[PDB]
Coordinates of all heavy atoms in Angstrom, one line a residue:
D96 N 144.0 70.0 111.5 CA 144.7 71.3 111.7 C 144.2 72.1 112.9 O 143.1 71.9 113.4 CB 144.8 72.1 110.4 CG 143.5 72.4 109.8 OD1 142.5 72.6 110.6 OD2 143.4 72.6 108.7
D97 N 145.1 73.0 113.4 CA 144.7 73.9 114.4 C 143.5 74.7 114.2 O 142.7 74.9 115.1 CB 145.9 74.8 114.8 CG 147.0 74.0 115.5 OD1 146.8 72.8 115.8 OD2 148.1 74.6 115.8
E98 N 143.2 75.1 112.9 CA 141.9 75.8 112.5 C 140.7 75.0 112.9 O 139.7 75.4 113.4 CB 142.0 76.3 111.2 CG 142.3 77.8 111.1 CD 142.5 78.3 109.6 OE1 141.8 77.7 108.7 OE2 143.4 79.1 109.4
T99 N 140.8 73.7 112.4 CA 139.7 72.8 112.7 C 139.5 72.6 114.2 O 138.4 72.4 114.7 CB 139.9 71.5 112.0 OG1 140.0 71.6 110.6 CG2 138.7 70.4 112.2
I100 N 140.6 72.4 114.9 CA 140.6 72.1 116.3 C 139.9 73.3 117.1 O 139.2 73.0 118.0 CB 142.0 72.0 116.9 CG1 142.6 70.6 116.5 CG2 142.1 72.1 118.4 CD1 144.1 70.4 116.7
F101 N 140.2 74.5 116.6 CA 139.5 75.6 117.3 C 137.9 75.7 116.9 O 137.2 76.1 117.7 CB 140.1 77.0 116.9 CG 139.5 78.1 117.7 CD1 139.9 78.5 119.0 CD2 138.4 78.8 117.2 CE1 139.3 79.5 119.7 CE2 137.7 79.8 117.9 CZ 138.2 80.2 119.1
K102 N 137.6 75.4 115.7 CA 136.2 75.4 115.3 C 135.4 74.4 116.2 O 134.3 74.8 116.7 CB 136.0 75.0 113.9 CG 136.6 75.9 112.8 CD 136.1 75.4 111.4 CE 136.7 76.4 110.3 NZ 135.7 76.6 109.2
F103 N 136.0 73.3 116.5 CA 135.5 72.3 117.3 C 135.3 72.8 118.8 O 134.2 72.7 119.4 CB 136.2 71.0 117.2 CG 135.6 69.9 118.0 CD1 134.6 69.1 117.4 CD2 136.0 69.6 119.3 CE1 134.0 68.0 118.0 CE2 135.4 68.5 120.0 CZ 134.4 67.8 119.4
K104 N 136.3 73.4 119.4 CA 136.3 73.9 120.7 C 135.3 75.0 120.9 O 134.6 75.0 121.9 CB 137.7 74.4 121.1 CG 138.8 73.4 121.3 CD 140.1 74.1 121.6 CE 141.1 73.0 122.0 NZ 142.5 73.8 122.0
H105 N 135.3 75.9 119.9 CA 134.3 77.0 120.0 C 132.9 76.6 119.9 O 132.1 77.0 120.7 CB 134.7 77.9 118.8 CG 134.0 79.3 118.9 ND1 132.8 79.5 118.5 CD2 134.5 80.5 119.4 CE1 132.4 80.8 118.7 NE2 133.5 81.4 119.2
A106 N 132.6 75.6 119.0 CA 131.3 75.1 119.0 C 130.8 74.4 120.2 O 129.7 74.6 120.7 CB 131.2 74.1 117.8
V107 N 131.7 73.6 120.9 CA 131.5 72.9 122.1 C 131.3 73.9 123.2 O 130.4 73.7 124.0 CB 132.5 71.9 122.4 CG1 132.3 71.2 123.8 CG2 132.5 70.8 121.4
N108 N 132.2 74.8 123.3 CA 132.2 75.9 124.3 C 130.9 76.7 124.1 O 130.1 76.7 125.1 CB 133.5 76.8 124.2 CG 134.7 76.1 124.8 OD1 134.6 75.2 125.6 ND2 135.9 76.5 124.3
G109 N 130.7 77.3 123.0 CA 129.5 77.9 122.6 C 128.2 77.2 123.0 O 127.1 77.8 123.2
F110 N 128.3 75.9 123.0 CA 127.1 75.1 123.3 C 126.9 74.9 124.8 O 125.7 74.9 125.3 CB 127.2 73.6 122.7 CG 126.1 72.7 123.1 CD1 124.9 72.7 122.4 CD2 126.2 71.9 124.2 CE1 123.9 71.8 122.8 CE2 125.2 71.1 124.6 CZ 124.1 71.0 123.9
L111 N 127.9 74.7 125.5 CA 127.9 74.5 127.0 C 127.3 75.7 127.8 O 126.7 75.6 128.8 CB 129.2 74.0 127.5 CG 129.7 72.7 126.9 CD1 131.0 72.4 127.3 CD2 128.7 71.5 127.4
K112 N 127.8 76.9 127.3 CA 127.5 78.1 127.9 C 125.9 78.4 127.7 O 125.2 79.0 128.5 CB 128.3 79.3 127.5 CG 128.2 79.8 126.1 CD 129.0 81.1 125.9 CE 129.0 81.4 124.4 NZ 127.7 81.4 123.8
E113 N 125.5 77.9 126.5 CA 124.1 78.3 126.1 C 123.1 77.1 126.7 O 121.9 77.3 126.6 CB 123.9 78.3 124.6 CG 124.5 79.5 124.0 CD 123.6 80.1 122.8 OE1 122.6 80.6 123.1 OE2 124.1 79.8 121.6
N114 N 123.7 76.1 127.3 CA 122.9 75.0 127.8 C 123.4 74.5 129.1 O 123.4 73.3 129.4 CB 122.8 73.9 126.8 CG 122.0 74.2 125.6 OD1 122.5 74.7 124.6 ND2 120.7 74.0 125.6
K115 N 123.9 75.3 130.0 CA 124.4 75.0 131.3 C 123.3 74.4 132.2 O 123.5 73.7 133.1 CB 125.1 76.1 132.0 CG 126.0 75.5 133.0 CD 127.2 76.5 133.4 CE 128.1 75.8 134.3 NZ 129.2 76.8 134.6
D116 N 122.0 74.8 131.9 CA 120.9 74.2 132.5 C 120.6 72.8 132.1 O 120.2 71.9 132.9 CB 119.6 75.1 132.3 CG 119.5 76.3 133.2 OD1 120.5 76.5 133.9 OD2 118.6 77.0 133.2
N117 N 120.8 72.5 130.8 CA 120.5 71.2 130.3 C 121.6 70.1 130.6 O 122.7 70.4 131.1 CB 120.5 71.3 128.7 CG 119.4 72.1 128.2 OD1 119.5 72.7 127.0 ND2 118.3 72.2 128.9
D118 N 121.3 68.9 130.3 CA 122.2 67.8 130.1 C 122.1 67.3 128.7 O 122.6 66.2 128.4 CB 121.9 66.6 131.1 CG 123.0 65.7 131.3 OD1 124.2 66.2 131.2 OD2 122.8 64.6 131.6
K119 N 121.6 68.2 127.9 CA 121.6 67.9 126.3 C 123.1 67.7 125.9 O 124.0 68.3 126.4 CB 121.0 69.2 125.7 CG 119.5 69.3 125.7 CD 119.1 70.3 124.7 CE 117.6 70.5 124.6 NZ 117.3 71.5 123.7
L120 N 123.2 66.8 125.0 CA 124.5 66.4 124.6 C 125.0 66.9 123.2 O 124.1 67.3 122.4 CB 124.6 64.8 124.5 CG 124.2 64.0 125.7 CD1 124.4 62.6 125.6 CD2 124.9 64.6 127.0
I121 N 126.2 67.0 123.0 CA 126.8 67.3 121.7 C 127.1 65.9 121.0 O 127.9 65.1 121.5 CB 128.1 68.0 121.8 CG1 127.8 69.2 122.8 CG2 128.5 68.5 120.4 CD1 129.1 69.7 123.3
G122 N 126.4 65.6 119.9 CA 126.7 64.4 119.2 C 127.6 64.7 118.1 O 127.4 65.4 117.2
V123 N 128.8 64.0 118.2 CA 129.8 64.1 117.2 C 130.0 62.9 116.3 O 129.9 61.8 116.8 CB 131.2 64.3 117.9 CG1 132.3 64.5 116.8 CG2 131.2 65.5 118.8
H124 N 130.1 63.1 115.0 CA 130.2 62.0 114.1 C 131.2 62.2 112.9 O 131.2 63.3 112.4 CB 128.8 61.4 113.6 CG 128.3 62.2 112.4 ND1 128.8 62.0 111.1 CD2 127.3 63.1 112.3 CE1 128.1 62.7 110.3 NE2 127.2 63.4 111.0
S125 N 132.0 61.2 112.6 CA 132.7 61.2 111.3 C 132.1 60.1 110.4 O 130.9 60.0 110.5 CB 134.2 61.0 111.6 OG 134.4 60.0 112.6
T126 N 133.0 59.4 109.7 CA 132.4 58.3 108.9 C 132.2 57.1 109.8 O 131.0 56.6 109.9 CB 133.2 57.8 107.8 OG1 133.3 59.0 106.8 CG2 132.6 56.7 107.0
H127 N 133.2 56.7 110.6 CA 133.1 55.6 111.5 C 132.8 56.1 112.9 O 132.5 55.3 113.8 CB 134.3 54.8 111.5 CG 134.7 54.4 110.1 ND1 135.8 54.9 109.4 CD2 134.1 53.6 109.2 CE1 135.9 54.5 108.2 NE2 134.9 53.6 108.0
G128 N 132.9 57.4 113.2 CA 132.7 57.9 114.5 C 133.9 57.5 115.4 O 133.7 57.3 116.6
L129 N 135.1 57.2 114.8 CA 136.1 56.7 115.5 C 137.4 57.5 115.5 O 137.9 58.0 116.5 CB 136.5 55.3 114.9 CG 137.5 54.5 115.7 CD1 137.0 54.1 117.2 CD2 137.8 53.2 115.0
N130 N 137.9 57.8 114.3 CA 139.2 58.3 114.3 C 139.2 59.9 114.3 O 139.7 60.4 115.4 CB 139.9 57.9 112.9 CG 140.2 56.4 113.0 OD1 140.8 55.9 114.0 ND2 139.8 55.7 112.0
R131 N 138.6 60.5 113.3 CA 138.5 61.9 113.4 C 137.7 62.4 114.7 O 138.0 63.3 115.4 CB 137.9 62.5 112.2 CG 138.9 62.4 110.9 CD 138.1 62.7 109.7 NE 137.3 61.6 109.4 CZ 136.4 61.6 108.3 NH1 136.3 62.7 107.5 NH2 135.6 60.5 108.1
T132 N 136.6 61.6 114.9 CA 135.7 61.9 116.1 C 136.5 61.8 117.4 O 136.5 62.7 118.2 CB 134.6 61.0 116.2 OG1 133.8 61.1 115.0 CG2 133.7 61.2 117.4
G133 N 137.2 60.7 117.6 CA 138.0 60.4 118.7 C 139.0 61.5 118.9 O 139.3 61.9 120.0
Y134 N 139.7 61.9 117.8 CA 140.8 62.9 118.0 C 140.2 64.2 118.5 O 140.7 64.6 119.6 CB 141.5 63.2 116.7 CG 142.5 64.3 116.9 CD1 143.8 63.9 117.4 CD2 142.3 65.6 116.6 CE1 144.8 64.9 117.7 CE2 143.2 66.6 116.9 CZ 144.4 66.2 117.4 OH 145.4 67.2 117.6
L135 N 139.2 64.7 117.9 CA 138.7 66.0 118.2 C 138.1 66.0 119.7 O 138.3 66.9 120.5 CB 137.7 66.5 117.2 CG 138.3 66.9 115.9 CD1 137.3 67.4 114.9 CD2 139.3 68.0 116.1
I136 N 137.4 64.9 120.0 CA 136.8 64.9 121.4 C 137.9 64.9 122.4 O 137.9 65.7 123.3 CB 135.9 63.7 121.4 CG1 134.6 63.9 120.7 CG2 135.7 63.3 122.9 CD1 133.6 62.8 120.8
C137 N 138.9 63.9 122.3 CA 140.0 63.9 123.2 C 140.9 65.1 123.2 O 141.4 65.5 124.2 CB 140.9 62.7 122.8 SG 140.1 61.1 123.1
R138 N 141.0 65.7 122.0 CA 141.9 67.0 121.9 C 141.2 68.0 122.8 O 142.0 68.8 123.5 CB 142.0 67.5 120.5 CG 142.9 68.8 120.5 CD 144.3 68.4 120.3 NE 145.1 68.5 121.6 CZ 146.2 67.9 121.9 NH1 146.7 67.1 120.9 NH2 146.9 68.0 122.9
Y139 N 139.9 68.1 122.8 CA 139.2 69.1 123.5 C 139.3 68.8 125.0 O 139.5 69.7 125.8 CB 137.7 69.2 123.1 CG 136.9 70.0 124.0 CD1 136.6 71.4 123.6 CD2 136.2 69.6 125.2 CE1 135.8 72.2 124.5 CE2 135.5 70.3 126.0 CZ 135.3 71.7 125.6 OH 134.4 72.5 126.4
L140 N 139.2 67.6 125.4 CA 139.2 67.1 126.8 C 140.6 67.4 127.4 O 140.6 67.9 128.4 CB 138.9 65.6 126.9 CG 137.4 65.3 126.6 CD1 137.2 63.8 126.7 CD2 136.5 66.1 127.5
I141 N 141.6 67.0 126.7 CA 143.0 67.3 127.0 C 143.3 68.8 127.2 O 143.7 69.2 128.2 CB 144.0 66.7 126.0 CG1 144.0 65.1 126.0 CG2 145.4 67.2 126.4 CD1 144.5 64.5 124.8

């Protein structure tokens, strides 16, 4: 849902501004790290 989609964007956004010096990564995982993970990552990129 759109609520989950925003929680994800905000966390990723909130992370990149706090670590623009780093190349530290955001590790995203679901059960397989495929379907839900893939959706959210791509939804943010798009």
Side-chain angles (χ1 to χ4, degrees):
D96 56 28
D97 289 352
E98 263 174 32
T99 302
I100 287 169
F101 185 90
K102 294 190 183 213
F103 186 84
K104 290 178 173 168
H105 193 273
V107 174
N108 287 335
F110 172 87
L111 299 168
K112 70 174 169 52
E113 290 217 74
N114 290 92
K115 199 159 188 180
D116 278 6
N117 294 155
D118 198 28
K119 284 192 175 179
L120 305 187
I121 312 156
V123 180
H124 84 75
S125 42
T126 297
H127 312 109
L129 187 63
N130 293 309
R131 292 168 287 175
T132 300
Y134 178 82
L135 288 179
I136 283 180
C137 295
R138 179 89 259 158
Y139 173 95
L140 293 180
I141 294 157

